[PDB]
Design a protein around this ligand. Structure first.
Ligand SMILES: NCc1cccc(C2CCN(C(=O)c3cccc(-c4cccc([B@@-]5(O)Oc6ccc(C(=O)N7CCC(c8cccc(CN)c8)CC7)cc6O5)c4)c3)CC2)c1
Length: 243
């Protein structure tokens, strides 16, 4: 997370950290709890190639990475079958946990948007995670969960911005219809936040609008952050995750 601030303990109780086995169980991507056995994340965090499940674990909401880890194993990685790269799209995946988690005020699910919600500009939305605090700047220890309020840009503004300073033909779409843009040069996600949630408050409920997907660097001029658009993938999600 670039810009913004350390998150409060009572906020983002759905935030998840994904961990890869090595010298230590290292954070590489975010996720969100959308059901007691289901984490929603980005496909590029776990694919496109098939990983060893035993090398992957999940950590539920933690104010600081590593200090009070209670890792949780994973029984299934479902990755969207359209997925090959983030730039093409369908950068969305699901993790099933070996057990259902227990829900509380500290730790509970996020609500998915109804298919009609467009998330127009001037909606207040926050993105969260333990990723880099700028281009090539690691989040320093003690690795607090960060948040930043990001302005949503309409898809067509954002596509056009990605064409400024580019050779790519204006008619050749870069920001796709299954994607969502937010951020500016002060406020953005970065590496390490991929797979975590962009959430927007609507009628006093938090809805996850996006999954942190990609961008040309972080908080770079004319390069807003790009997120997978959750509305686009509800039917796919619901094929696996009960209502
Ligand atoms: N601010 C929002 C935000 C949120 C989260 C994360 C980000 C980051 C996204 C990635 N970043 C980019 O700037 C970026 C931007 C655009 C495109 C890319 C990108 C472009 C093309 C490919 C990829 B890649 O992710 O997709 C890949 C597919 C394959 C490979 C690979 O295996 N190699 C590359 C090709 C190499 C190669 C070269 C020559 C010949 C061969 C054949 N033997 C093979 C071999 C290694 C490597 C790959 O990298 C990424 C990266 C940094 C910031 C941003």
């Amino acid at each position: 997370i670039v810009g913004g601030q350390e998150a409060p303990r009572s906020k983002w109780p759905w935030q998840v950290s994904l961990r890869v086995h090595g010298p230590y169980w290292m954070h590489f991507c975010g996720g969100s709890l959308i059901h007691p056995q289901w984490v929603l994340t980005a496909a590029h965090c776990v694919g496109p190639d098939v990983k060893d499940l035993a090398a992957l674990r999940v950590q539920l909401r933690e104010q600081h990475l590593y200090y009070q880890d209670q890792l949780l194993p994973v029984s299934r990685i479902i990755v969207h079958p359209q997925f090959y790269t983030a730039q093409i799209g369908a950068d969305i995946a699901l993790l099933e946990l070996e057990e259902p988690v227990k829900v509380s005020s500290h730790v509970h699910t996020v609500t998915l948007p109804p298919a009609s919600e467009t998330f127009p500009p001037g909606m207040p939305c926050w993105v969260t995670g333990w990723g880099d605090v700028d281009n090539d700047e690691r989040l320093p220890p003690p690795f607090p969960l960060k948040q930043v309020k990001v302005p949503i840009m309409e898809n067509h503004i954002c596509d056009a911005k990605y064409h400024l300073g580019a050779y790519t033909g204006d008619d050749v779409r870069i920001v796709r219809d299954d994607m969502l843009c937010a951020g500016n040069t002060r406020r953005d996600s970065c590496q390490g936040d991929s797979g975590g949630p962009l959430v927007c408050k609507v009628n006093g409920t938090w809805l996850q609008a996006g999954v942190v997907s990609w961008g040309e660097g972080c908080a770079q001029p004319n390069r807003p952050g790009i997120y997978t658009r959750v509305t686009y993938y509800l039917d796919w999600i619901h094929h696996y995750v009960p209502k």
